[PDB]
Ligand binder design. Structure first.
Ligand SMILES: CCCCCCCCc1cn(CCC[C@@H]2CO[C@H](COS(=O)(=O)NC(=O)[C@@H](N)CC(C)C)[C@@H](O)[C@H]2O)nn1
Ligand SMILES: [Mg+2]
Ligand SMILES: [Zn+2]
Length: 847
């Protein structure tokens, strides 16, 4: 055994030992319990970043832990390959997105292999290959014929300078984020998944997920946004009907979740597109201007609640069906056409948004709920104003004194008897628009024929292959400019026809890839029945919190769609969910000519602990704040530089020790060095142990007869095994597991292990320590284990707790006063807490 730890000389050998043993290449072996551990697969963007290394090290720790516990562990990796990154790189570099993508995959794959992740590379998928995306085209066609996928006109943000469609997030003050041109609202036909048909199942099935973080489930519930409310119809006042047709001339229908407060409504509000808004605005320029502003907004959903709420009065009035009040109709920017009826009532005394709106416009606030003897102040919102549980109705006529549920039913009764309303369930959830006007994505398998309509491509003709010999130029979506792609014959009649040229939302590929891993070469279906039956669901899913709403909702939805098609047997794709925190780093810059900043990458900087300077010249830089690693402030630390300087195990150890997985992980030069020094210490501890006599049989069995010092070390050892097992298995807090092994090594360092029994215990300590750390730093532990013991580390298995090492050897002593037993220097103090002391047997209190 070499004296000094050298990662470069042991990490490739360990990797070849694992590869040759095919330990990570798993099959559907019915004789070993399965465990499916999945880290969210990466976009092949070019090179790994620290977020990747953190994520996949966490996944590898859990996978290797389960492997040592005897599970048949599938840990697959693949590439989420479609999307805008490659399209832009193409525009920037004059290369095909496919060529850029495949070169990135090859490079990043080598990087992942160099980190020693126990990955089943025979299950690799790349979502941009027709062998993958043919199956989501297949599902699309099946659902399209059932109406679960449908085609409908929708409104998009069109950027006329860049000639591209923009998400709301890419619109800044009504202008495209890159072009700076005013965007145009355009109506275009698009394809939608009818995910609202599954809203109730997606909501209720969250309750099954006892091993999901409660905040992820709360976010999904709020996103789905089910409410149980009341449709209420306010008759349009006789003076307010000009310009109105049909039922819009008769009543204004609203939806409310608080019909118990209907007696306290003081105005109503409609969307900009509502017919009452249109009729009121016909002669009123301020209203026309307000409506135009509302229609031109592009506020992202994440920002909707934060936008300033504004409205304009219409001079039109409706009548409250309960109390007969005439209420003015307002147009408001927070009422969205297409949600419910596009009209709401307002109760400013008991809804905080209505309170602030009414406070702004000096609209009335009417208390109709009381909570105890709490004083109501119309001028200041109090939390109890919105309480639904502990209030009773006041100022509500014959409804006074009722609680929420009784008042709800009473109002429903009154409204239904009048014909003025009825209970109604609503969902915030929108259907999922999947059309993208982009080239680098899965083609939509539709052919447009003027005789037959929008025709799904037959299953025998799938895939619709995306041509890879394309370099986007930026002047519009390439597929629409390629008649060699879109000109075709109709599969139903043989006539002239055109292929759909929009591609699929790339969330589609990540909504089912976890099933494709189960049989990635299966050519007769999305996933083979035998594989789906064996692997079932993902046991452990690991990924970033930014995917907690959309990706997870879509994956759950696709799972239920595939279940209903008879392809899988589970209702939910992911049993346990671990969401990792971001990686952050200090920022540095040097000053600018126009009073700005230009940002320096950390690896090009050297500190002095006073100031910092640039490595190339040694001139001063300015240390700035710490924030998430990104190209924006050039504070990404390249993991390849970390691996080149210290090796894979140091990178993995630092990532796992620096913070618990959910916490933000702060890049630290000294922390990286400390991780490396600990691996050197581990190496030296084993080297020095073996140099004093070589390996012996590890201590096992009855420890009666061991010295106290060695009993104490065995107690620490099995205490540490218990802690580490609970940290890996239950708490998923790997930093504390590492610290526990460090404390064990500290106690070992202070214990004399030179005797025959001491060497047996030292062997037991070191054999446990290297297996406890193997999930985290497998290369060095594999190597050290081989010097300690001739068995296959993965066949020795996870260390077992010896409960006998955890019980302490007590001796029962009799106590007596004046020679008569009255119960049963250290022993003197206990018998007084109960003086001749016959050592260990008798203590006598000279009364
Ligand atoms: C090189 C110059 C730039 C430096 C950048 C530094 C970034 C540091 C950072 C980032 N973050 C956020 C979490 C990142 C997780 C990383 O690993 C997985 C794959 O990320 S991906 O490739 O972006 N693919 C995806 O997120 C999707 N393909 C997953 C699909 C299942 C939907 C996911 O779990 C992610 O959530 N924290 N620190
Ligand atoms: Mg359960
Ligand atoms: Zn046809």
């Amino acid at each position: 055994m070499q004296e000094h730890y050298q990662p470069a000389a042991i990490e490739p050998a360990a990797q070849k030992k694992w590869d040759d043993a095919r330990i990570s290449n798993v099959s559907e072996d019915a004789s070993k319990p399965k465990y499916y551990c999945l880290s969210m697969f990466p976009y092949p963007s070019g090179k790994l970043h620290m977020g990747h290394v953190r994520n996949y090290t966490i996944g590898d720790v859990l996978s290797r832990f389960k492997l040592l516990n005897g599970f048949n562990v599938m840990q697959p990796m693949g590439w989420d390959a479609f999307g805008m990154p490659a399209e832009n790189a193409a525009m920037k570099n004059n290369v095909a997105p496919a060529a850029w993508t495949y070169d990135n995959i090859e490079y990043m794959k080598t990087q992942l292999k160099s980190l020693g992740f126990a990955v089943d590379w025979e299950r690799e998928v790349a979502t941009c290959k027709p062998e993958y995306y043919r199956w989501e085209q297949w599902l699309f066609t099946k659902l399209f014929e059932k109406g679960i996928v449908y085609r409908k006109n929708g409104t998009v943000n069109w950027d006329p300078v860049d000639q591209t469609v923009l998400a709301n997030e890419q619109v800044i003050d009504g202008r495209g984020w890159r072009s700076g041109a005013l965007i145009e609202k355009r109506e275009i036909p698009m394809y939608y998944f009818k995910i609202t048909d599954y809203a109730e199942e997606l909501l209720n099935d969250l309750d099954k997920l006892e091993h999901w973080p409660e905040q992820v489930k709360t976010m999904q519930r709020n996103w789905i946004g089910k409410s149980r409310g009341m449709t209420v119809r306010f008759a349009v006042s006789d003076d307010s009907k000009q310009g109105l047709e049909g039922d819009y001339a008769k009543f204004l229908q609203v939806y409310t979740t608080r019909p118990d407060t209907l007696m306290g409504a003081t105005y109503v509000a409609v969307a900009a597109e509502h017919p009452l808004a249109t009729a009121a605005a016909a002669d009123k320029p301020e209203l026309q201007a307000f409506i135009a502003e509302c229609k031109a907004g592009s506020v992202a959903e994440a920002d909707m609640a934060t936008m300033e709420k504004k409205g304009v009065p219409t001079g039109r009035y409706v009548v409250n069906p309960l109390n007969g009040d005439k209420l003015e109709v307002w147009i408001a920017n927070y009422v969205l056409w297409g949600y419910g009826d596009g009209a709401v009532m307002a109760v400013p005394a008991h809804d905080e948004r209505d309170f602030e709106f009414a406070a702004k416009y000096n609209l009335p606030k009417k208390q109709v709920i009381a909570v105890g003897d709490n004083a109501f102040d119309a001028n200041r919102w109090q939390e109890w104003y919105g309480d639904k549980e502990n209030g009773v109705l006041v100022n509500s006529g014959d409804l006074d004194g009722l609680d929420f549920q009784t008042a709800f039913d009473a109002v429903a009764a009154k409204l239904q008897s009048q014909g003025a309303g009825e209970p109604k369930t609503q969902y915030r959830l929108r259907d999922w628009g999947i059309s993208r006007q982009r080239y680098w994505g899965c083609p939509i398998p539709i052919v447009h024929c003027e005789k037959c309509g929008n025709v799904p491509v037959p299953a025998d003709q799938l895939p619709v292959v995306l041509p890879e010999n394309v370099v986007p130029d930026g002047m519009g979506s390439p597929l629409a400019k390629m008649p060699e792609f879109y000109e075709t014959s109709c599969p139903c009649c043989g006539g002239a026809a055109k292929r759909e040229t929009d591609t699929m939302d790339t969330f589609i590929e990540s909504s089912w890839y976890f099933f494709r891993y189960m049989s990635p070469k299966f050519s007769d279906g999305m996933v083979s029945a035998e594989s789906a039956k064996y692997w079932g669901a993902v046991d452990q899913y690991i990924g970033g919190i930014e995917h907690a709403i959309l990706h997870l909702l879509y994956a759950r939805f696709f799972t239920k769609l595939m279940r209903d098609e008879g392809l899988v047997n589970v209702d939910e794709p992911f049993e346990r969910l671990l969401t990792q925190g971001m990686v952050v780093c200090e920022t540095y810059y040097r000053e600018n000519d126009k009073g700005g900043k230009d940002w320096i990458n950390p690896a090009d900087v050297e500190l002095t602990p006073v100031s910092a300077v640039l490595k190339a010249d040694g001139l001063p830089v300015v240390i700035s704040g710490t924030e998430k690693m990104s190209k924006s402030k050039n504070n990404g630390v390249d993991p390849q530089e970390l691996i080149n300087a210290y090796g894979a195990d140091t990178a993995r150890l630092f990532m796992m020790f620096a913070a618990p997985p959910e916490q933000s992980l702060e890049w630290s030069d000294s922390g990286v060095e400390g991780a490396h020094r600990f691996l050197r210490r581990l190496w030296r501890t084993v080297y020095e142990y073996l140099k004093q006599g070589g390996a012996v049989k590890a201590f096992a069995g009855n420890q009666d007869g061991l010295s106290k010092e060695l009993k104490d070390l065995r107690h620490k050892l099995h205490s540490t095994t218990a802690k580490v097992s609970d940290d890996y298995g239950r708490r998923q807090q790997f930093n504390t597991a590492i610290a526990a092994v460090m404390e064990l090594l500290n106690q070992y360092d202070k214990t004399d292990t030179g005797s025959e029994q001491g060497r047996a215990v030292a062997q037991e300590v070191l054999e446990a320590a290297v297996r406890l750390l193997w999930p985290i730093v497998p290369h060095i532990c594999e190597t050290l284990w081989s010097e300690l013991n001739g068995a296959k580390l993965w066949e020795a298995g996870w260390p077992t707790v010896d409960e006998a090492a955890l019980v302490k050897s007590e001796i029962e002593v009799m106590v007596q006063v004046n020679g008569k037993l009255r119960g049963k220097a250290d022993l003197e103090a206990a018998a007084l807490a109960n003086i001749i002391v016959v050592p260990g047997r008798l203590v006598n209190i000279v009364v």
